[PDB]
Amino acid sequence: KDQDRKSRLMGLEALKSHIMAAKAVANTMRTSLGPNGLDKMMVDKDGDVTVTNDGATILSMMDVDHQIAKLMVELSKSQDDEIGDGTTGVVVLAGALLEEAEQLLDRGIHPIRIADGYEQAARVAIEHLDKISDSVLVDIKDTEPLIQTAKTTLGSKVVNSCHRQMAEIAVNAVLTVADMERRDVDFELIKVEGKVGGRLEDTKLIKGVIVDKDFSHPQMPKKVEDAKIAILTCPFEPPKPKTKHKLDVTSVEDYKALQKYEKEKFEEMIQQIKETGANLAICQWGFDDEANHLLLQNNLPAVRWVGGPEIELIAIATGGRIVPRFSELTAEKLGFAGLVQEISFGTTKDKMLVIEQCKNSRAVTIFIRGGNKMIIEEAKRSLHDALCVIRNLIRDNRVVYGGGAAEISCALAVSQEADKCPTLEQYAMRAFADALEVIPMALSENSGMNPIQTMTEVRARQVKEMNPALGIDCLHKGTNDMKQQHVIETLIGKKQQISLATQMVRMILKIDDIRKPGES
Amino acid sequence: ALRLTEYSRTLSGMESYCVRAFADAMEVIPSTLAENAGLNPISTVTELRNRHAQGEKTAGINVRKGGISNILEELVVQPLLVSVSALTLATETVRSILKIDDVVNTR
Amino acid sequence: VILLKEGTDSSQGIPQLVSNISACQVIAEAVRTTLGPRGMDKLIVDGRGKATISNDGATILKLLDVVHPAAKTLVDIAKSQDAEVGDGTTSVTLLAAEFLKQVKPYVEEGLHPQIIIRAFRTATQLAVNKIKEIAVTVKKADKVEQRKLLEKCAMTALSSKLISQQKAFFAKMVVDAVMMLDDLLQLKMIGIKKVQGGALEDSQLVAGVAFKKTFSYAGFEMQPKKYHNPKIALLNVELELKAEKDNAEIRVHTVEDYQAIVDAEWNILYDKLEKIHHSGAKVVSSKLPIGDVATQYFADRDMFCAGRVPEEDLKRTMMACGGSIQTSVNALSADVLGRCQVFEETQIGGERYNFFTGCPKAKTCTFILRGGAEQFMEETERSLHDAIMIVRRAIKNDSVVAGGGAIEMELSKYLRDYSRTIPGKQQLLIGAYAKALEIIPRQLCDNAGFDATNILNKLRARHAQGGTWYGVDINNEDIADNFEAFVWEPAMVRINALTAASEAACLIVSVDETIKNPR
């Protein structure tokens, strides 16, 4: 039903309209590509204002009605699990393949035939990346070169001031939760938190789970060396409901009667801690003044008002379980850790709970200090792709020199392989070469230099001067050959940029119609 | 058009795109002869670029038989002065047009 | 003042028949480019905002819902095509509308519609007799094992694809998956699951029923996976500690009653866990999530539980283990419990996956997709589904014909020579009947990006040399033999295709006046 007022777009004009809608997204993000890329202003629906150049964050905040424009956004969820940095470079590359495809549609070439040309030329570019790739950690596991690589990725963000200290933390964090030989690193085991105040140089590496909550009483012991952890959903006191107790006291007769029953419940549960051998008691709610009075005499520190999701994160990291009631307590459900401390921040009353294992563990949490919440939020994303860079080096240590040296070297091989295909797909291979040149071209344009004179100059150097690929300096450094500048991106990332961009172009060309009913 | 593409790769600066555009504009002559001969203009030019890469100038378009065959065997030949004067005179006109910023009427 | 119709819209004669012909071409236009394995896709969005992307002709026609009365006729014929055969809805819709295009100029010349009906009835009857003569039954031919022929037919349909390099390995898995079935073949039995990561050679063929097992919750290092003869229970009950469905809220002023209410809320959950243990069900498959507290119970009882299982995987499990889906834990008994020979939790892909083995009532299996991304697997999912259809139809009907427009050209040549031998008005109509059968091989060339004119002209001259099996090749551009290339389709499917196309064409022509009662 609802056939009237149904938006329909079909024919050859439908493909040119889809490309135009796709170029609107590519032309928007191509200015933010690279470390010198301009920022974007974000106005939230609630009135908040934030400024970031991160491409994955922009695509999440862009609200686009057009269907093909929505497909470009769904690609970010797939790439962020791998690269998380050059995600913008894929959207720019996807827009270049479609922009050059518009010239081919005027010649009468079928769209499926064009998509076959990109797939054929993609395998040539991927194969060329394997020959020019060099290794680092091959056959020898070392942390010295691994730290220097992460120092460059953080240079493109606002954390570029403290960038050197945060590199050693991400290295020891990934190696702790997983071994490089295992080549399996889960992002769910790594958490990142932060709080306003301090500086980015105060970032520390704590092995365990950390949440911001205070102790039940300030005089409780601040250091627990032995590992005993009681994690319950109920506080230690006479049982109280989850909302409001509302005790009914008619007169002093009911006061003295119920107080004795409460007094029996006061000493019962507090002394129950020592019966199970537990030391630290983690309860979802707080304690009364009488409950904390018995803990000081028995030296039993505890944490109050623990959040709902915080209970699950503590039991997993410390190796404990969630205990609904004190009747099920046992020795196996106790959590373990090396040290428990309470570290405050300046004069602030936060006093975040610190759980330290005093050894290696399978989960770590990085905490960040800073004077602005927006800078800390961008510092969280600064470590996100940094963990991916380290993870990619663990999976495959072969790397290809970035800064545009990779994309330019591939088009030289693809352009030569084009004359070996006596068929109409030859044009698609030539258009695929000019599309790879766009990513290194947008780097020079964002640096305030002539794009064309910089691109053609590097081409002559790779063909004549030296066979190894040479890059473009967008930071206004001494000269080219980023190998000395130590700007390097992983090989796995280079293979995904070409593979994911080919998927998007192939899906957009094969869709000749978009249907949807209107408001009746 | 095939050899100027290789020379465009060895050069540097703006001459890379300018010479390449001059080479791609040379394919309009064979694309027109294939259209009047009842063939596919896009597919015929593609096959000739491969035959000229591996082979020699012999490959071409035969309008009498309506297909790609040996031009020398079909008794089709033209003197060299016609092709040389075609590139020289056309270039001087294109360069003259690009040098004109504005026209002014006098009296 | 006094009007007969009073807003009633009705028309008859030639213009009413011409208006219906133009309406049928609009329906065939939407499914026109979707014909063939390499055909382009379509994108349809409903009122909810979600987009449906596929080239399936049966799915597109269901979402259109055209209000034109003559358009609803061709839509209803596609529904009858599924019950009789199950495929070819795109071919029937595209071919039936082609006959109306050829006889359209003859209608404007004053030809009576009844004579047109006489032509489509006679010509279709002769086409059925010609198909039965050409159809050759291939069973023991050349003393080749039938498994070898089924693999060669699968590699042809999977050629020039992403798996075209690995199609030699996947051809064995598709044939083996069909051989694991019973004598009654059904496409809805075999399931297909996708797993990200790993190469194409990592794809596993599971004889039992496997599911993604999205369950992320706790309970690890317990619940031994190996069970010799477990009791498989199907329950939609939610075992979560604090759940949206089952809770307990009681407001009392008594402090001693609070200990019982908190225990009573845990008692209801403990009772639901005990009723499962009361029946002795080792494997617990839940559709709703299961809390961490319920996982520790079964862990100490030497029983396994997994939640967050889709409903379709539970229905495939019901037909597998032999039990039935029970909503609550109260009616759980040995009648709804299943049995499997081997149950093991596999780490393949790094995710936790569960599957059965050797279920007595299981007619179904599960295939695992392994690729670089999701789009590689989703397209391969249907690509392998088409390969299963070829192997399934080859076993059921052993008498086939050459596909790819090969049989369409012979019926066009045979009826072209017979039309000359029938003096009358039947000559021009049957001559147009043969030309309309050539739209099927023409759309295959346009959807493949080839040149339809050069292929069809050289193909037509080739049938004049006597070869009846030659047709269009979708991979390489050339005229090839589809019989030696092992592109086969059942003869009864093609007969029902011409019968449904001729019936839908004669019905639209037989319609004269359109009467609409205002209401």
Swiss-Prot record, chain A:
Subunit structure: Component of the chaperonin-containing T-complex (TRiC), a hexadecamer composed of two identical back-to-back stacked rings enclosing a protein folding chamber. Each ring is made up of eight different subunits: TCP1/CCT1, CCT2, CCT3, CCT4, CCT5, CCT6A/CCT6, CCT7, CCT8. Interacts with PACRG. Interacts with DNAAF4. Interacts with DLEC1. Interacts with SPMAP2.
Reactions mediated catalytically: ATP + H2O = ADP + phosphate + H(+)
A Pfam family annotated for this UniProt entry: Cpn60_TCP1
Name of the gene: CCT5
Homology family: Belongs to the TCP-1 chaperonin family.
Cross-link (Glycyl lysine isopeptide (Lys-Gly) (interchain with G-Cter in SUMO2)): 1, 191, 195, 246, 256, 260, 373
Protein name: T-complex protein 1 subunit epsilon
Residues annotated to bind ATP: 34, 87-88, 403
PROSITE patterns: TCP1_1 (PS00750), TCP1_2 (PS00751), TCP1_3 (PS00995)
Induction profile: Down-regulated in response to enterovirus 71 (EV71) infection (at protein level).
EC nos: 3.6.1.-
Post-translational modification: Ubiquitinated by the DCX(DCAF12) complex specifically recognizes the diglutamate (Glu-Glu) at the C-terminus, leading to its degradation.
Modified residues (Phosphoserine): 7, 327, 520
Ligand binding (Mg(2+)): 85
InterPro entries cross-referenced by the UniProt entry: Chap_CCT_epsi, Chaperone_TCP-1, Chaperonin_TCP-1_CS, Cpn60/GroEL/TCP-1, GroEL-like_apical_dom_sf, GROEL-like_equatorial_sf, TCP-1-like_intermed_sf, TCP-1_chaperonin
Leading EC class: hydrolase
Domain of life according to the entry: Eukaryota
Membrane-crossing segments per the record: none
Location in or out of the cell: Cytoplasm; Cytoplasm, Cytoskeleton, Microtubule organizing center, Centrosome
Biological process annotations from GO: binding of sperm to zona pellucida; chaperone mediated protein folding independent of cofactor; chaperone-mediated protein folding; positive regulation of protein localization to Cajal body; positive regulation of telomerase RNA localization to Cajal body; positive regulation of telomere maintenance via telomerase; protein folding; protein stabilization
Organism: Homo sapiens
Entries under Gene3D superfamilies matching the protein: GroEL, GroEL-like equatorial domain, TCP-1-like chaperonin intermediate domain
Swiss-Prot record, chain B:
Record localization: Cytoplasm; Melanosome; Cytoplasm, Cytoskeleton, Microtubule organizing center, Centrosome; Cytoplasm, Cytoskeleton, Cilium basal body
Binding locations of ADP: 78
Bilayer-crossing regions: none
Phosphoserine modifications at: 12
Subunit structure, interactors included: Component of the chaperonin-containing T-complex (TRiC), a hexadecamer composed of two identical back-to-back stacked rings enclosing a protein folding chamber. Each ring is made up of eight different subunits: TCP1/CCT1, CCT2, CCT3, CCT4, CCT5, CCT6A/CCT6, CCT7, CCT8. Interacts with PACRG. Interacts with DNAAF4. Interacts with DLEC1.
Family listed: Belongs to the TCP-1 chaperonin family.
Function field: Component of the chaperonin-containing T-complex (TRiC), a molecular chaperone complex that assists the folding of actin, tubulin and other proteins upon ATP hydrolysis. The TRiC complex mediates the folding of WRAP53/TCAB1, thereby regulating telomere maintenance. As part of the TRiC complex may play a role in the assembly of BBSome, a complex involved in ciliogenesis regulating transports vesicles to the cilia.
Disease: De novo genetic variants in nearly every subunit of the TRiC complex, including CCT4, have been found in individuals with a broad spectrum of brain malformations, and clinical phenotypes ranging from mild to severe epilepsy, developmental delay, intellectual disability, ataxia, and other features of cerebral malfunction.
Protein name: T-complex protein 1 subunit delta
Organism: Homo sapiens
Protein's gene: CCT4
Range within the parent protein: 433 to 539 of 539
From Swiss-Prot, chain C:
Coiled-coil boundaries: none
Subcellular location: Cytoplasm
Annotated Mg(2+) binding sites: 87
Disulfide bonds: none
Chain sites annotated for binding ADP: 36, 88-91, 159-160, 404, 489, 494
Residues the record lists as binding ATP: 36, 88, 91, 393, 404, 494
Keywords tagged on the record: Acetylation, ATP-binding, Chaperone, Cytoplasm, Hydrolase, Isopeptide bond, Methylation, Nucleotide-binding, Ubl conjugation
Enzyme Commission number(s) from the entry: 3.6.1.-
Recorded disease: De novo genetic variants in nearly every subunit of the TRiC complex, including CCT7, have been found in individuals with a broad spectrum of brain malformations, and clinical phenotypes ranging from mild to severe epilepsy, developmental delay, intellectual disability, ataxia, and other features of cerebral malfunction.
PANTHER family, per the entry: CHAPERONIN
Name of the molecule in the record: T-complex protein 1 subunit eta
Organism for this UniProt entry: Homo sapiens (Human)
Name of the gene: CCT7
